[PDB]
Amino acid sequence: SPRRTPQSIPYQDLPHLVNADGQYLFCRYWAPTGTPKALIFVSHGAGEHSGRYEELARMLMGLDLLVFAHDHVGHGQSEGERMVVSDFHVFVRDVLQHVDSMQKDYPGLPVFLLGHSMGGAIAILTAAERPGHFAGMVLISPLVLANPESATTFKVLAAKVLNSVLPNLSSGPIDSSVLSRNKTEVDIYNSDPLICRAGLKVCFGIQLLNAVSRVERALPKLTVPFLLLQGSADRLCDSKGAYLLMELAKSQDKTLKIYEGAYHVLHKELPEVTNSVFHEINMWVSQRTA
Numbered sequence: 001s002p003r004r005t006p007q008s009i010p011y012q013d014l015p016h017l018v019n020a021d022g023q024y025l026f027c028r029y030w031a032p033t034g035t036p037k038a039l040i041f042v043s044h045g046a047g048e049h050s051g052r053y054e055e056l057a058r059m060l061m062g063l064d065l066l067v068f069a070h071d072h073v074g075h076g077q078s079e080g081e082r083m084v085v086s087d088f089h090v091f092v093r094d095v096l097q098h099v100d101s102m103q104k105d106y107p108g109l110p111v112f113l114l115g116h117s118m119g120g121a122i123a124i125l126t127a128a129e130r131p132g133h134f135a136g137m138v139l140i141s142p143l144v145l146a147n148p149e150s151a152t153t154f155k156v157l158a159a160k161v162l163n164s165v166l167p168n169l170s171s172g173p174i175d176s177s178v179l180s181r182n183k184t185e186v187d188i189y190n191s192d193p194l195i196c197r198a199g200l201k202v203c204f205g206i207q208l209l210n211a212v213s214r215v216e217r218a219l220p221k222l223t224v225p226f227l228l229l230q231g232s233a234d235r236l237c238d239s240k241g242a243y244l245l246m247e248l249a250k251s252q253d254k255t256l257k258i259y260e261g262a263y264h265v266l267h268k269e270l271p272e273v274t275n276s277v278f279h280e281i282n283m284w285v286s287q288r289t290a
């Protein structure tokens, strides 16, 4: 009986990678027909999975980048208790393993990171561990500062869980209605069986708060070029965090675009926003691969 995804598919039938904890991570690749000009790792966020990046990945592949991703532990088709992580650094360690593996297979190529929300915090922390080694980072509403209502809710609950033994204490789910003004994208999110929409475990929310704390400490070490895209009406990642990232990162090549009125998932927003997001990422990555 082979090791299977949480959805019962044998890993031997799928692209995969075994992490340092012996857990199978489901992997995705979008490689061009020609010779790749760069590599780019796509880092998905909490609750979701790498298949939600199909359209972005196909655009980047069309620029002759080799796009690759995996489902973070506890997410999508990867192993692990759902939306649990022993420590947030597991996510960063696993990204670095996959990046290092791909860099061996495609030596000499520059490597970019792209991350949304929790995946953007992962990307920041990944780049901060390897100053000078990444060519650029694209951040879509990265988790730099949590929505303050969410932060206060979990900080109070964290007091219970950090002082008692309450392993399964949960709060509300990530609210789908604040993900996007595009109702069809909200409905798609609520329909995808690979998305975990349960109430957030307090221990997982604690790791999200750990991510915020570690991102703050990482900013003085962050020198990678980056493009930062942020909606002004984001009720999940506070736009104040995007401004603070622009202020505190030491990168010499940093650009912020604010989408006025837009919600959290900018690459799945109203068409005017999403089209701009795709266009801006295309141009920014193109300029830095040439």
Ligand SMILES: CC1=CC(C)=[N+]2C1=Cc1ccc(CCC(=O)NCCOc3ccccc3CC3CC4(C3)CN(C(=O)N3CC5(COC(=O)N5)C3)C4)n1[B-]2(F)F
Pocket: 044, 045, 046, 047, 048, 052, 116, 117, 118, 119, 143, 146, 147, 149, 150, 151, 153, 154, 173, 174, 175, 176, 178, 179, 189, 200, 205, 206, 208, 209, 235, 236, 237, 265, 268
């Ligand atoms: C007056 C009032 C009363 C109450 C009660 N509220 C009030 C007001 C507000 C305002 C907002 C909220 C709630 C907003 C909400 O849902 N928080 C969820 C909990 O978040 C956290 C919990 C702990 C730590 C940190 C956070 C914030 C992070 C940011 C992410 C949660 C989103 N994720 C992420 O990586 N990605 C990928 C996704 C999925 O797929 C996509 O495509 N992208 C989303 C990480 N309230 B309220 F509290 F309801």
